[PDB]
């Protein structure tokens, strides 16, 4: 029987008949305490009883149910999580019922690290990733940028080779929010681990899609960072058309992002013995000054550093 911690008829463990045999163990905070938390009666009660069962290493059904309350009170207590995992194995607990429980607590506390690590352990134990992608998609439906949800998703996909529908899921979330950086990261994760970006048709499709996204939302930094990230590998100067194609967006779709990208192309050209070296240098230096003084003054120190760096190297 599960007496919920929030139930109106919840009773402190010290008032429970089935717990009378055991003395709760108080926390030893020393004689002159520091960072001492004045625990609520409910918290102190559960934790003094958790300490008793832990200290005596009681691998019982009652100790198992108690870890659920200790976790609900403080889901970041990794000592409790460890003992709960000892009890799951010692007591031979049904791991699918434990999956139902972890699903419920992750829904309640989706930013807690311990809950996600526990779910990974259960998936490993059961060798069953079948509910994973759908469960994660439900968390991502509430917070599309939840870092642990994306990390658990990449772990599941990589460990169980569930690559096949991920690019489609990425396309769906990018339609919902083109500015979702976690999703542009997922796009790179899928492509790099499947076809790779060396395949010319793949690269062309990716750059075209990104340029279309930049046209629709010019001030969306994620698409600009993605375009740079997928082309910086081989070097921006390796793509001669790109420069003129971005210059063709200078009046209509301009931003400090387009200007900064132009400086990035110029830096690579100067590092790869480009034609018209002094012309490229002055163009780059002009943009560094426009960025530092007018269009991106928050980054004045970076842009001045770049200007000085370019001068020092390509004078």
């Amino acid at each position: 029987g599960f007496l919920s911690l929030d139930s109106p008829t919840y009773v402190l463990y010290r008032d429970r008949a089935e717990w009378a045999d055991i003395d709760p163990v108080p926390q030893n905070d020393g004689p002159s305490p520091v960072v001492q938390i004045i625990y609520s009666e409910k918290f102190r009660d559960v934790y003094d009883y958790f300490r008793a069962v832990l200290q005596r290493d009681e691998r019982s059904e009652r100790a198992f149910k108690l870890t659920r309350d200790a976790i609900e009170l403080n889901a970041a207590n990794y000592t409790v999580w460890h003992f709960r995992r000892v009890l799951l194995r010692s007591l031979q607990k049904d791991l699918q019922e434990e999956m139902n429980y972890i699903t419920a607590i992750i829904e309640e506390q989706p930013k807690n690290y311990q809950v996600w690590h526990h779910r990974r352990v259960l998936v490993e134990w059961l060798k069953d990733p079948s509910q994973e992608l759908e469960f994660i998609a439900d968390i991502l439906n509430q917070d599309a940028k939840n870092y642990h949800a994306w990390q658990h998703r990449q772990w599941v996909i990589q460990e169980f080779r569930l690559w096949d529908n991920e690019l489609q899921y990425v396309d769906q979330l990018l339609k919902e929010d083109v500015r979702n950086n976690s999703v542009w990261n997922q796009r790179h994760f899928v492509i790099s681990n499947t076809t790779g970006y060396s395949d010319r048709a793949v690269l062309e499709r990716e750059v075209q899609y990104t340029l279309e996204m930049i046209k629709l939302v010019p001030h969306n930094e994620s698409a600009w960072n993605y375009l740079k990230g997928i082309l910086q590998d081989r070097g921006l100067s390796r793509y001669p058309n790109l420069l003129n194609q971005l210059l063709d967006l200078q009046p209509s779709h301009s931003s400090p992002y387009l200007i900064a990208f132009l400086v990035d192309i110029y830096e690579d050209m100067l590092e790869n013995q480009c034609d018209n070296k002094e012309d490229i240098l002055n163009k780059a230096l002009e943009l560094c000054e426009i960025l530092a003084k007018e269009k991106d003054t928050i980054r004045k120190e970076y842009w001045r550093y770049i200007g000085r760096s370019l001068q020092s190297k390509h004078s």
Partner: protein, 403 residues
């Protein structure tokens, strides 16, 4: 006017959503409107802007929290050495001394947190974990007495680190726990401070951290993950300790971190297209001195001789105007409640933004009243530079445990 965030041209820094609204732009616009109300309050109330760090209010909040906390802190019952570190470091930045009785009570409490098998747990009798191990070592080093140094069981600490070490170069946060870039930093920080680095302890670690640098230029928690300020600081700081900063593409990292400063708010966001947050004042801005040191070691001639590569003024303005709780303590952004974590990191980031250093060169930028000047902080350890030298020199008298 003399404040960058209050200049008429600063209005041009507001979000441009291109008439395409998404959850991201909507949430950003809400934050910007709230920050604009803060920036304009002086204009609307017909008062001369005065930027004052509320030292006495922050001091009261901290001296009290060091001894006792309400049940609102139950969520941090497995993070008690973090509370010691956050509070002791905030008091250190505010140039507040530690009474010898307090220093002794902290030492004794951390002794109770120390595991018989090495490392520290989040509280008395809790299992050891690298995050409270890092916090406990940092707190003991801020105290810096013989008693504090003697608390650390160096032989078991090394044993503990070896037990977490993975064949791929990574470290578990704890036994039966997970791997992330924070663990490499926690291990490198405690191991370097206590002089327990053996020749093979960090074998493959630099290479594993370098695998966490992604297409964005920043560092993810594990390989494949989105670049994040907290992990990027952990990754670069651990590589500085190991003298392996070169394993990263430093230029793509420099471009990524500088891009994280918000043109409007002046503070830093944790990742691209997410919100400004006062704690990133340390995690993100703290990367600039580390990058400065790394590039200088490569003999970069184009580096500044007076400023870090971020807007030191705009960051101080964001912290001073938006991150102070009137009752004392600091916070993420206006509307959020104070906590000791944000108090520690807002103040850590303020110190970094105030103090530039590179070899012979020393240059301060103190926004508002001169009393706002904080004690400097070490960009690798986030404890006072004097505490770093004192601890390192002390532990270097001891041989590396022979096993």
């Amino acid at each position: 006017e003399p404040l960058y965030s209050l200049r008429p041209e600063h209005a041009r820094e507001r979000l441009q959503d291109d008439s395409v609204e998404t959850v991201t732009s909507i949430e950003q616009a809400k934050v910007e409107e709230k920050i604009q109300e803060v920036f304009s309050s002086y204009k609307f109330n017909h008062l001369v802007p005065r930027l004052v760090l509320q030292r006495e209010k922050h001091f009261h909040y901290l001296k009290r929290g060091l001894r006792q906390l309400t049940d609102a802190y139950e969520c941090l019952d497995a993070s008690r050495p973090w509370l010691c570190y956050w509070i002791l470091h905030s008091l250190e930045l505010l140039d507040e001394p530690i009474p010898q009785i307090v220093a002794t009570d902290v030492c004794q409490f951390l002794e109770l947190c120390q595991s018989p098998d090495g490392g520290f747990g989040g509280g008395p009798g809790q299992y050891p974990h690298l995050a409270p191990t890092y916090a406990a070592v940092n707190a003991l080093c801020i105290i810096g007495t013989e008693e504090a140094y003697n608390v650390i069981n160096r032989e078991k600490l090394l044993q503990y680190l070896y037990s977490l070490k993975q064949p791929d170069g990574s470290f578990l946060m704890h036994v039966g726990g997970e791997v992330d870039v924070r663990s490499a930093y926690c291990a490198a920080s405690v191991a370097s401070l206590t002089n327990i680095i053996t020749p093979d302890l960090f074998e493959g670690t630099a290479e594993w951290i370098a695998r966490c640098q992604n297409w964005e230029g920043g560092i993810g928690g594990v390989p494949g993950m989105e670049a994040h300020g907290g992990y990027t600081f952990c990754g670069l700081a651990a590589l500085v300790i190991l003298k392996k900063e070169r394993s990263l593409n430093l230029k793509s990292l420099l471009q990524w971190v500088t891009s994280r400063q918000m043109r409007f708010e002046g503070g830093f966001q944790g990742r691209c297209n997410k919100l400004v947050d006062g704690c990133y004042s340390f995690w993100q801005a703290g990367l600039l001195p580390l990058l400065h040191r790394a590039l200088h070691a490569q003999g970069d001639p184009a580096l500044s001789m007076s400023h870090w590569m971020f807007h030191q003024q705009a960051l101080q303005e964001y912290i001073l105007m938006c991150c102070q709780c009137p009752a004392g303590g600091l916070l993420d952004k206006p509307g959020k409640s104070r906590d000791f974590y944000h108090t520690c990191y807002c103040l850590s980031g303020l110190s970094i933004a105030q103090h530039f250093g590179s070899g012979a060169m020393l240059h301060d930028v103190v926004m508002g009243v001169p009393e706002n000047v904080l004690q400097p902080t070490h960009p690798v350890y986030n404890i006072g530079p004097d505490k770093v030298i004192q601890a390192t020199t002390h532990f270097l008298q001891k041989p590396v445990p022979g096993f």
